[PDB]
Tab-separated table of C-alpha atoms in Angstrom:
chain	number	residue	atom	x	y	z
A	20	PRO	CA	90.425	78.227	131.121
A	21	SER	CA	91.033	78.225	127.149
A	22	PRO	CA	93.637	78.294	124.409
A	23	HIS	CA	94.216	81.542	122.800
A	24	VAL	CA	91.556	82.139	120.033
A	25	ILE	CA	93.067	82.863	116.764
A	26	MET	CA	91.491	85.702	114.689
A	27	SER	CA	93.356	85.410	111.314
A	28	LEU	CA	95.926	83.625	109.304
A	29	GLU	CA	98.234	86.422	110.094
A	30	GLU	CA	98.002	86.466	113.855
A	31	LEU	CA	98.683	82.543	113.733
A	32	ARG	CA	101.664	83.031	111.671
A	33	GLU	CA	102.916	85.507	114.146
A	34	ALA	CA	102.204	83.199	117.022
A	35	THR	CA	103.881	80.182	115.677
A	36	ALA	CA	107.080	82.254	114.750
A	37	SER	CA	107.838	82.180	118.520
A	38	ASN	CA	110.428	79.671	119.511
A	39	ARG	CA	108.174	78.378	122.283
A	40	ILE	CA	106.168	75.558	121.259
A	41	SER	CA	102.723	76.230	119.726
A	42	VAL	CA	99.950	73.616	119.749
A	43	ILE	CA	97.043	74.609	117.654
A	44	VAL	CA	93.676	72.876	117.523
A	45	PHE	CA	91.617	73.310	114.317
A	46	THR	CA	87.925	72.829	115.056
A	47	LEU	CA	84.344	73.389	113.840
A	48	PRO	CA	82.024	75.594	116.062
A	49	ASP	CA	78.847	73.598	116.383
A	50	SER	CA	80.778	70.589	117.270
A	51	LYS	CA	79.588	69.428	120.680
A	52	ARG	CA	82.894	68.536	122.120
A	53	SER	CA	84.640	71.267	120.340
A	54	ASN	CA	84.402	73.020	123.807
A	55	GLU	CA	85.731	69.765	125.493
A	56	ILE	CA	88.754	69.402	123.338
A	57	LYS	CA	89.553	73.129	123.659
A	58	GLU	CA	89.428	72.920	127.495
A	59	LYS	CA	91.358	69.503	127.515
A	60	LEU	CA	93.949	71.212	125.338
A	61	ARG	CA	94.433	74.049	127.762
A	62	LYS	CA	94.505	71.719	130.731
A	63	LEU	CA	97.031	69.630	129.044
A	64	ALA	CA	99.333	72.876	128.545
A	65	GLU	CA	99.716	73.235	132.326
A	66	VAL	CA	102.110	70.301	132.575
A	67	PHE	CA	104.135	71.454	129.486
A	68	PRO	CA	106.283	74.386	130.541
A	69	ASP	CA	107.271	76.092	127.262
A	70	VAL	CA	103.972	75.301	125.464
A	71	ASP	CA	101.228	77.897	124.163
A	72	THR	CA	97.973	76.658	122.955
A	73	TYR	CA	95.647	78.207	120.235
A	74	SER	CA	92.253	77.525	118.807
A	75	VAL	CA	91.189	78.124	115.179
A	76	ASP	CA	87.619	78.038	114.117
A	77	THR	CA	88.004	76.854	110.597
A	78	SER	CA	84.615	78.137	109.509
A	79	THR	CA	85.570	81.815	110.086
A	80	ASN	CA	89.296	81.244	108.978
A	81	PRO	CA	89.156	79.588	105.611
A	82	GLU	CA	92.686	81.080	104.750
A	83	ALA	CA	94.355	79.553	107.795
A	84	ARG	CA	92.705	76.107	107.015
A	85	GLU	CA	94.122	76.204	103.543
A	86	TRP	CA	97.421	77.493	104.697
A	87	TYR	CA	97.850	74.628	107.113
A	88	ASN	CA	96.206	72.078	104.835
A	89	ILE	CA	93.544	71.114	107.492
A	90	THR	CA	91.429	68.506	105.669
A	91	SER	CA	89.441	67.206	108.735
A	92	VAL	CA	88.497	68.652	112.057
A	93	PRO	CA	89.511	68.514	114.862
A	94	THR	CA	93.234	68.418	113.907
A	95	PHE	CA	96.121	69.600	116.242
A	96	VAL	CA	99.238	71.057	114.713
A	97	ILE	CA	102.529	71.469	116.422
A	98	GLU	CA	104.884	74.246	115.650
A	99	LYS	CA	108.074	75.718	116.716
A	100	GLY	CA	109.840	78.786	115.222
A	101	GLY	CA	107.468	78.722	112.048
A	102	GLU	CA	108.273	74.943	111.437
A	103	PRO	CA	105.413	72.411	111.820
A	104	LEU	CA	106.770	69.651	114.060
A	105	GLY	CA	103.785	67.382	113.996
A	106	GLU	CA	100.102	66.801	113.416
A	107	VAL	CA	97.379	64.717	115.205
A	108	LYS	CA	94.160	64.100	113.285
A	109	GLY	CA	91.105	63.530	115.446
A	110	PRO	CA	89.984	64.328	118.961
A	111	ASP	CA	92.620	62.051	120.466
A	112	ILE	CA	94.108	64.191	123.350
A	113	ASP	CA	96.419	61.317	124.502
A	114	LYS	CA	98.028	60.876	121.047
A	115	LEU	CA	98.615	64.552	121.183
A	116	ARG	CA	100.297	64.328	124.608
A	117	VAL	CA	102.464	61.353	123.540
A	118	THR	CA	103.458	63.037	120.385
A	119	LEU	CA	104.343	66.277	122.168
A	120	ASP	CA	106.314	64.457	124.792
A	121	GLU	CA	108.483	62.554	121.939
A	122	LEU	CA	109.471	65.918	120.646
A	123	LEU	CA	110.572	67.079	123.900
A	124	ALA	CA	112.840	64.155	124.326
B	17	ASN	CA	109.635	82.681	111.409
B	18	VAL	CA	111.798	85.551	112.860
B	19	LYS	CA	115.587	86.306	113.026
B	20	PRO	CA	116.995	85.551	116.475
B	21	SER	CA	115.558	88.824	117.888
B	22	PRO	CA	116.791	91.170	119.078
B	23	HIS	CA	119.979	90.498	117.123
B	24	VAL	CA	123.004	91.077	119.328
B	25	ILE	CA	125.549	93.672	117.507
B	26	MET	CA	128.963	93.285	117.715
B	27	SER	CA	130.601	96.398	116.006
B	28	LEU	CA	129.476	99.851	114.664
B	29	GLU	CA	130.432	98.506	111.192
B	30	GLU	CA	127.806	95.766	111.624
B	31	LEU	CA	125.234	98.149	112.990
B	32	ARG	CA	125.614	100.639	110.327
B	33	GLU	CA	125.327	98.035	107.460
B	34	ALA	CA	122.172	96.728	109.406
B	35	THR	CA	120.302	100.076	109.662
B	36	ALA	CA	121.124	101.119	106.118
B	37	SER	CA	118.187	98.848	104.984
B	38	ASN	CA	114.942	100.541	104.016
B	39	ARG	CA	113.280	98.490	106.729
B	40	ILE	CA	112.572	100.093	110.065
B	41	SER	CA	115.409	99.054	112.636
B	42	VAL	CA	114.764	99.478	116.542
B	43	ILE	CA	117.964	99.244	118.451
B	44	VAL	CA	118.217	99.133	122.272
B	45	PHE	CA	121.392	100.409	123.776
B	46	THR	CA	122.022	98.740	127.175
B	47	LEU	CA	124.223	97.780	129.987
B	48	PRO	CA	124.997	94.077	130.588
B	49	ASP	CA	122.765	93.022	133.633
B	50	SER	CA	120.466	95.764	134.636
B	51	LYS	CA	117.273	94.559	136.714
B	52	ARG	CA	115.060	95.313	133.298
B	53	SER	CA	117.292	93.507	131.061
B	54	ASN	CA	115.509	90.191	130.638
B	55	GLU	CA	112.183	92.208	130.181
B	56	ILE	CA	113.801	94.525	127.546
B	57	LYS	CA	114.920	91.485	125.493
B	58	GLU	CA	111.663	89.640	125.837
B	59	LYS	CA	109.885	92.825	124.684
B	60	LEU	CA	112.015	93.563	121.835
B	61	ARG	CA	111.557	89.910	120.814
B	62	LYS	CA	107.737	89.911	120.900
B	63	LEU	CA	107.718	93.322	118.872
B	64	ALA	CA	109.670	91.722	116.177
B	65	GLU	CA	107.299	88.798	115.997
B	66	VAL	CA	104.244	91.159	115.781
B	67	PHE	CA	105.940	93.668	113.371
B	68	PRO	CA	106.804	92.063	109.956
B	69	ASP	CA	108.998	95.008	108.420
B	70	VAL	CA	110.857	95.729	111.722
B	71	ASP	CA	114.143	94.587	112.751
B	72	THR	CA	115.276	94.796	116.441
B	73	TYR	CA	118.860	95.057	117.706
B	74	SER	CA	120.736	95.132	121.008
B	75	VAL	CA	123.996	96.952	121.580
B	76	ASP	CA	125.967	96.389	124.852
B	77	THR	CA	127.444	99.888	125.359
B	78	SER	CA	129.999	98.592	127.840
B	79	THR	CA	131.739	96.664	124.913
B	80	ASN	CA	130.760	98.897	122.260
B	81	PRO	CA	131.870	102.589	122.912
B	82	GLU	CA	132.184	103.608	119.317
B	83	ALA	CA	128.507	102.590	118.693
B	84	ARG	CA	127.536	104.598	121.824
B	85	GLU	CA	129.368	107.585	120.681
B	86	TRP	CA	128.139	107.319	117.198
B	87	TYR	CA	124.414	107.432	118.118
B	88	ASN	CA	124.934	110.039	120.831
B	89	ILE	CA	123.635	107.838	123.581
B	90	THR	CA	123.640	109.921	126.864
B	91	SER	CA	121.797	107.280	129.140
B	92	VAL	CA	120.860	103.524	129.071
B	93	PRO	CA	118.631	102.014	128.250
B	94	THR	CA	117.772	103.977	125.143
B	95	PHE	CA	115.929	102.923	122.111
B	96	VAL	CA	116.640	104.291	118.705
B	97	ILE	CA	114.384	103.835	115.603
B	98	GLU	CA	116.029	104.234	112.218
B	99	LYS	CA	115.192	103.699	108.622
B	100	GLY	CA	117.540	103.954	105.695
B	101	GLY	CA	120.336	105.119	108.171
B	102	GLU	CA	118.286	108.207	109.302
B	103	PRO	CA	116.851	108.396	112.838
B	104	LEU	CA	113.065	108.487	113.147
B	105	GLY	CA	112.676	108.551	116.881
B	106	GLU	CA	114.253	107.892	120.441
B	107	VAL	CA	112.889	106.549	123.712
B	108	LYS	CA	114.606	107.257	126.828
B	109	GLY	CA	114.253	104.997	129.718
B	110	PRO	CA	113.187	101.444	130.141
B	111	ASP	CA	109.801	102.434	128.859
B	112	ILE	CA	109.009	99.877	126.282
B	113	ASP	CA	105.402	100.406	126.418
B	114	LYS	CA	106.508	104.004	125.221
B	115	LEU	CA	108.608	102.287	122.561
B	116	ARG	CA	105.834	100.370	120.988
B	117	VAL	CA	103.438	103.473	121.194
B	118	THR	CA	106.175	105.649	119.559
B	119	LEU	CA	106.721	103.093	116.844
B	120	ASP	CA	102.941	102.832	116.046
B	121	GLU	CA	102.791	106.657	115.750
B	122	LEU	CA	105.888	106.260	113.257
B	123	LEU	CA	104.047	103.800	111.084
B	124	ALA	CA	100.933	105.952	111.171
B	125	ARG	CA	100.199	108.802	108.755
B	126	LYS	CA	99.820	112.021	110.506
B	127	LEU	CA	96.769	114.035	109.790
C	20	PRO	CA	80.267	91.789	108.314
C	21	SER	CA	82.883	94.492	107.240
C	22	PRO	CA	82.831	97.422	109.711
C	23	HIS	CA	79.870	99.657	109.215
C	24	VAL	CA	80.684	102.958	107.521
C	25	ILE	CA	79.867	105.968	109.674
C	26	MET	CA	78.058	108.951	108.240
C	27	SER	CA	78.268	111.560	110.905
C	28	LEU	CA	79.368	112.447	114.403
C	29	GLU	CA	75.679	111.934	115.419
C	30	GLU	CA	75.364	108.436	114.046
C	31	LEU	CA	78.716	107.498	115.739
C	32	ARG	CA	77.746	108.706	119.251
C	33	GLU	CA	74.437	106.996	118.998
C	34	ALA	CA	76.254	103.821	117.997
C	35	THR	CA	78.647	104.019	120.912
C	36	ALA	CA	75.798	104.442	123.300
C	37	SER	CA	74.936	100.800	123.147
C	38	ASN	CA	76.066	98.525	126.107
C	39	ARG	CA	77.703	96.368	123.577
C	40	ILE	CA	81.337	97.130	122.992
C	41	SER	CA	81.928	99.476	119.863
C	42	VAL	CA	85.594	99.303	118.078
C	43	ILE	CA	86.028	102.283	115.631
C	44	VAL	CA	88.726	102.642	113.141
C	45	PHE	CA	89.618	106.203	111.929
C	46	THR	CA	91.193	106.003	108.451
C	47	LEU	CA	91.767	108.128	105.262
C	48	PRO	CA	89.680	107.114	102.253
C	49	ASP	CA	90.365	104.218	99.836
C	50	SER	CA	94.060	103.756	100.258
C	51	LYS	CA	94.981	100.126	100.109
C	52	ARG	CA	96.441	100.641	103.551
C	53	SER	CA	92.971	101.723	104.712
C	54	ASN	CA	91.083	98.789	103.125
C	55	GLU	CA	93.584	96.322	104.471
C	56	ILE	CA	93.080	97.721	108.204
C	57	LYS	CA	89.258	97.436	107.768
C	58	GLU	CA	89.620	93.794	106.912
C	59	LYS	CA	91.847	93.206	109.975
C	60	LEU	CA	89.178	94.997	112.031
C	61	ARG	CA	86.387	92.624	110.562
C	62	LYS	CA	88.327	89.482	111.553
C	63	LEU	CA	88.918	90.601	114.992
C	64	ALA	CA	85.133	91.109	115.391
C	65	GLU	CA	84.561	87.503	114.842
C	66	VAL	CA	86.534	86.433	117.948
C	67	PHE	CA	84.334	88.776	120.147
C	68	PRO	CA	80.698	88.146	120.224
C	69	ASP	CA	79.194	91.442	121.708
C	70	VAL	CA	81.634	93.615	119.637
C	71	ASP	CA	80.402	95.811	116.692
C	72	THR	CA	82.955	97.555	114.403
C	73	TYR	CA	82.803	100.891	112.641
C	74	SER	CA	84.801	102.869	110.120
C	75	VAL	CA	85.215	106.629	110.022
C	76	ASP	CA	86.637	108.476	107.033
C	77	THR	CA	88.425	111.523	108.687
C	78	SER	CA	88.286	113.488	105.430
C	79	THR	CA	84.477	113.337	105.208
C	80	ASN	CA	84.012	113.391	109.017
C	81	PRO	CA	85.961	116.498	110.153
C	82	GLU	CA	83.627	116.770	113.281
C	83	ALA	CA	84.198	113.203	114.281
C	84	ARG	CA	87.935	113.603	113.635
C	85	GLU	CA	88.118	116.603	116.019
C	86	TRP	CA	85.583	115.060	118.637
C	87	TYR	CA	87.756	111.884	119.076
C	88	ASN	CA	90.955	113.859	119.019
C	89	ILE	CA	92.174	111.940	115.936
C	90	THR	CA	95.775	113.242	114.864
C	91	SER	CA	97.020	110.192	113.051
C	92	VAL	CA	95.286	107.245	111.055
C	93	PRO	CA	94.488	104.638	111.379
C	94	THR	CA	93.586	105.053	115.150
C	95	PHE	CA	91.170	102.592	116.914
C	96	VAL	CA	88.781	103.716	119.709
C	97	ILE	CA	87.055	101.231	121.935
C	98	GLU	CA	83.858	102.446	123.639
C	99	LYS	CA	81.034	100.993	125.760
C	100	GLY	CA	77.923	102.788	126.822
C	101	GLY	CA	79.284	106.075	125.483
C	102	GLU	CA	82.420	105.757	127.570
C	103	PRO	CA	85.711	105.355	125.836
C	104	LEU	CA	87.660	102.343	127.134
C	105	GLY	CA	90.931	102.393	125.172
C	106	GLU	CA	92.663	103.831	122.203
C	107	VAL	CA	95.340	102.449	119.834
C	108	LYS	CA	97.179	105.131	117.588
C	109	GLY	CA	98.494	103.540	114.528
C	110	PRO	CA	98.320	100.168	112.705
C	111	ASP	CA	98.974	97.855	115.613
C	112	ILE	CA	96.064	95.457	115.333
C	113	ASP	CA	97.693	93.201	117.792
C	114	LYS	CA	97.718	95.825	120.581
C	115	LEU	CA	94.111	96.395	119.970
C	116	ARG	CA	93.424	92.649	120.417
C	117	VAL	CA	95.404	92.557	123.628
C	118	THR	CA	93.605	95.727	124.961
C	119	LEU	CA	90.268	94.190	124.160
C	120	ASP	CA	90.988	90.759	125.878
C	121	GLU	CA	92.240	92.705	129.000
C	122	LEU	CA	88.929	94.503	129.021
C	123	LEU	CA	86.827	91.511	128.871
C	124	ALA	CA	88.631	89.779	131.790
C-alpha cells in the first residue's frame, strides 16, 4: 500500500490545494530504501485520519523539485490548503510523525 | 489553493455578479438535506480543485426562490454551467459523473 | 519520451495490438492547447511503466478520426491488446489518470 504517485507539478498543486493535510515525500528512484520510506509513509497515514500521502520522484519532476525548493532527498513536505506547514529532511519517519502531531494539536 | 468550494450563494444579486465573469461557473441548485447532498458538495469541491478556471456555486432553492425562478429550475438537484452570464449547459439529476463529462465536452473543441 | 506521432490508422491499430497499455490523444494540429496536452500525456506516462503514449492529428488522419469515433479534441483512448478500455472526451488529464489507476487495480 503506497502513497499516490505524483505525475507533475500541476497534479501536485491541485492535490495540496485540498484542505485535508497532504504529506509529500520527495525521493530519488534508485535509492534502496526509497521503497521503504514510501511504504512507511503510507503505513503512517493509517493512524492519521484527514491525511493524504504523496510521493514525488524528483528525477522525473525537476519542476516540482524546484518549485518546492527540494535541496536533498528524501524530504517530506506537509501542506494544507496550498500552504506549507512543515518540512522534515531525511528518512526520519519518527520526526515526521512527531511534526505532524504537533500541527494537529 | 482554492476558494471555499462550492461557494454558498445567498441571493440572486450575488449569483448574477458571480456568473458575469468570463470564467466558467458551475452552479448546483439543491434542497437542504437530500440523501445525495454530502456527495454533491464533495464532488463539486474536487471538481473545483482539478479545474483551474472553473468556479463552483451552491444555491439552496428553499431559501432562494428568486434564483430558482430566474434560472428556470424545474427539479433539484440541477447543475447549470455558465460563462459570461450565458448558459452553456445543464445536467438534470444527481448525476455528477454526467456533470464532469458535460463540462469536459464544453471545454473541448468540437470537430 | 513525447507521445509518438501516428502516421495512419494502420500504424495505430498495430500499436494498440500490443499487450502493453496504449494511451492515444486525438488533437488538432499545432495549437498551443495541443502541444500543452501532449506534454501532459508524456508526464503521465512516467508514472506508468507498461504504458506507451501516442498522438493523432485528426486533420491529417481522417480515417482514424472516424474509426475511433472522435467528435471533439482532445480525446484520450486507452487500449490494450486491440481492445479499448476507456475513453475521456475533453481536456481532463486528471480523469484519464483516475481511469488508468482503476484499470491497473
